[PDB]
Design an enzyme around this catalytic site. Structure first.
Site, PDB file in Angstrom:
ATOM      1  N   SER A 151      -0.785  15.673 -12.146  1.00 11.84           N
ATOM      2  CA  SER A 151      -1.333  14.488 -13.596  1.00 11.84           C
ATOM      3  C   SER A 151      -1.532  16.465 -13.898  1.00 11.84           C
ATOM      4  CB  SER A 151      -1.869  13.968 -13.368  1.00 11.84           C
ATOM      5  OG  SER A 151      -2.590  13.779 -14.473  1.00 11.84           O
ATOM      6  N   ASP A 156       0.935  -1.322  -0.684  1.00 14.65           N
ATOM      7  CA  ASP A 156       0.044  -0.152  -0.202  1.00 14.65           C
ATOM      8  C   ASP A 156       1.348   1.289  -0.069  1.00 14.65           C
ATOM      9  OD1 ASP A 156      -2.021   2.266   0.433  1.00 14.65           O
ATOM     10  OD2 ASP A 156      -2.342   1.321   2.447  1.00 14.65           O
TER      11      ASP A 156
END
Length: 330
Positions: free
Chosen positions: A199, A35
Site C-alpha cells: 500500500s 481464505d
C-alpha cells in the site's frame, strides 16, 4: 468457464464469511470460509473426532462415488489465530458457483482445534493463496483456483465482501457492474506464498494522506485490519477514550463513539473504509467497551489487509503468469 457464488457473513459482526461449496457425487454442500491467506481446502468430515464436531455439516467420502483416498497423504495446518486442524486427504469433484474441478484435493479433518468446533457455521476452509503453502505431505496439492485456472475464461477470481450483507466470489471473469470507477492494479510478491502487496499510505478520517509504503497481505480469512503500530496509534488517537488494552488484546473504544473512516492507498488510488466498518461491538455481552477493527500487527510479523479493508473494495486476485492485485471502490 466461470463460477459465481454468494458469500454470507456468519454473524452480525462480519467475523467471517461462508460460501456454499459442492463436494462429491451426489453433491454434499458445505459452507466454507474462503481464505486468500492459506492454501488448504479442508472440511469437517465423517472422520472428525466426534467430540470435536458441534453442529457443522460434514463431508462423508464413503457416500461419494467420485471420492478416492489419496494414499499416504496427510495434512496439518496452524493458523495465525492459534487454531489448527489435521487429517487425511481424498480427491473428489468440487464445484463453486457452477465452476467444477475434478480431482480436487479435499482434506478431511480428523482433528480440529476448539475454535473450529465452537463455530458451528464454518464447515471448513477453502484456501486461495498460492499452492506453495499447501500443507499436504508427502505430495503437496493444488488449490481449487490453481486447478481451475487453465479452464477459466480469465485466470482471476474476485472478492466482493459485503458490510453486514452478502457479497460475491467470482471465478474467471470481472463483473464490471460490481464496482465504481476503475480498478487499480498493484504488484504482488509470491515469495511468502501470499497475495502480498505494498500500500502507498493512509489517511485517518478527513486528515491528510500520509505517503508511506505498507507491505501486507490481502487475506479474506482474517477478520480485521492489522497495520504497523504507528499507523494504528494515529487512527485511535482520533477516537476519544480509545486505548490499547493488554487484558482485552488490542484497541478498545467507547461504544458511544462515532468512528472516523480510514483510507488506504493503492498506487495513486484510495480506498475508504467507513468508520462503521471498524466497530466490532462490545468486548463482552453488555459491555460499553467496544473492540476495534484496526489493530496492531506488531506481534504478527506481517501486516494483514483483512475483511475490514477488503470489504470496502472490489478486489481482483489476478493469477496471470505474473500475479497482481486490483482494487476498485464500490
Amino acid at each position: 468457464s466461470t463460477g459465481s457464488a454468494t458469500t454470507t457473513p456468519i454473524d452480525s459482526l462480519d467475523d467471517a464469511y461462508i460460501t456454499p461449496v459442492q463436494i462429491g457425487t451426489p453433491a454434499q454442500t458445505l459452507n466454507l470460509d474462503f481464505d486468500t491467506g492459506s492454501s488448504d481446502l479442508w472440511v469437517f468430515s465423517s472422520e472428525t473426532t466426534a467430540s470435536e464436531v458441534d453442529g457443522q455439516t460434514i463431508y462423508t467420502p464413503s457416500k461419494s462415488t467420485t471420492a478416492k483416498l489419496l494414499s499416504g497423504a496427510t495434512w496439518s495446518i496452524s493458523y495465525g489465530d492459534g487454531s489448527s486442524s489435521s487429517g487425511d486427504v481424498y480427491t473428489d469433484t468440487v464445484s463453486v458457483g457452477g465452476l467444477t474441478v475434478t480431482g480436487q484435493a479435499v482434506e478431511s479433518a480428523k482433528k480440529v482445534s476448539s475454535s473450529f468446533t465452537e463455530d458451528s457455521t464454518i464447515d471448513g476452509l477453502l484456501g486461495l493463496a498460492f499452492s506453495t503453502l499447501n500443507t499436504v505431505s508427502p505430495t503437496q496439492q493444488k488449490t481449487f483456483f490453481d486447478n481451475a485456472k487453465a479452464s477459466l475464461d480469465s485466470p482471476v477470481f474476485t472478492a466482493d465482501l459485503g458490510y453486514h450483507a452478502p457479497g460475491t466470489y467470482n471465478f474467471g471473469f470481472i463483473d464490471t457492474t460490481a464496482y465504481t470507477g476503475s480498478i487499480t492494479y498493484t504488484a504482488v510478491s509470491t515469495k511468502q506464498g501470499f497475495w502480498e502487496w505494498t500500500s502507498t499510505g493512509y489517511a485517518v478520517g478527513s486528515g491528510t494522506f500520509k505517503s508511506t509504503s505498507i507491505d501486507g497481505i490481502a487475506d479474506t480469512g482474517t477478520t480485521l485490519l492489522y497495520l504497523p503500530a504507528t499507523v494504528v496509534s494515529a487512527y485511535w488517537a482520533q477516537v476519544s477514550g480509545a486505548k490499547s488494552s493488554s487484558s482485552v488484546g488490542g484497541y478498545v473504544f467507547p461504544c458511544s463513539a462515532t468512528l472516523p473512516s480510514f483510507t488506504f492507498g493503492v498506487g495513486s488510488a484510495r480506498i475508504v473504509i467507513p468508520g462503521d466498518y471498524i466497530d466490532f461491538g462490545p468486548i463482552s455481552t453488555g459491555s460499553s467497551s467496544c473492540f476495534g477493527g484496526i489493530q496492531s500487527s506488531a506481534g504478527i510479523g506481517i501486516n494483514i489487509f483483512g475483511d475490514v479493508a477488503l470489504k470496502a473494495a472490489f478486489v481482483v486476485f489476478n493469477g496471470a503468469t505474473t500475479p497482481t492485485l486490483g482494487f476498485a471502490s464500490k
